[PDB]
Design a protein around this ligand. Sequence first.
Ligand SMILES: Brc1cc2nn[nH]c2cc1Br
Length: 333
Amino acid sequence: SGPVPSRARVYTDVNTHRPREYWDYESHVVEWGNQDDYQLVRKLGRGKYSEVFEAINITNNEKVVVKILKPVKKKKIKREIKILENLRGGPNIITLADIVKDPVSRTPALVFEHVNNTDFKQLYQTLTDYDIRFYMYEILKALDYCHSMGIMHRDVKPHNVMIDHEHRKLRLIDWGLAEFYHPGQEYNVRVASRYFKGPELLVDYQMYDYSLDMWSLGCMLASMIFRKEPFFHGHDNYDQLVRIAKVLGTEDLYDYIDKYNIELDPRFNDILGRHSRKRWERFVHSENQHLVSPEALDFLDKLLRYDHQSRLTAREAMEHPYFYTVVKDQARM
Ligand SMILES: Brc1cc2nn[nH]c2cc1Br
């Protein structure tokens, strides 16, 4: 017997009830615009491979952001375009303004609404207690929306959250790894960055779902409240699970392996060892105690579970006490 199948606790069949066109992204026909409608101003520091650019729309003089798509399967391009189009106008989702090709090189590029080039990583180790809850709540709106729309992001990390702190404005960006959830579909586990990879990815359990994004959210939260970057600091993908095991303990790990009948890569057998589940108080100290509360810990604990089905959904997260004052203040303002 292979692995035991899994289904999402929420938004399970939403793509099935949609027209085929909603999710059959390979059949989507793109009307490619002309990139000469935009003049690039400067390269935005988004890493090495990345080719994001501040630019100007000549036609109306508005500032935009242009992402030159580095050569990759046309499949993957259509996927990112379709997801962005499907999620357009959703809470805290980056708006795709146009789809273009450079007339000479024919290289594909996506044109986005302007944001300040200040990602969450630059700000998220200097935030107040309140601001962490506020921005966590804002990320949760984007995730509940995209999940409700049948989409998992699969690359949630501080680098992919653009914050305008002056206007308290947040955009979840980089949907190039996002994918449509279909019950029973087995997915590629080579997604997300090391430190935010869910255990399902690490042990090679393929029938995963929206809950993946909630694990990554937990890693961000842990990092912010404990002022520890990253929280799970693995040398590689094998060691990454060891770092998780050293905090969450090995007992729940092996119970999770057994529950889903996961064949554990034999390489893991020597390295995981035996570890107790650590109390969060272990990571608290004078530098971070102002960010840490019972509510933060209870919330965090319910995100970081091996068993993907036992993690809070985005809507469940939004109803947690940790956000009560954020919710209260949002109602009045
Ligand atoms: Br800045 C920025 C970077 C991105 N990477 N992928 N999509 C993006 C959208 C914006 Br706006």
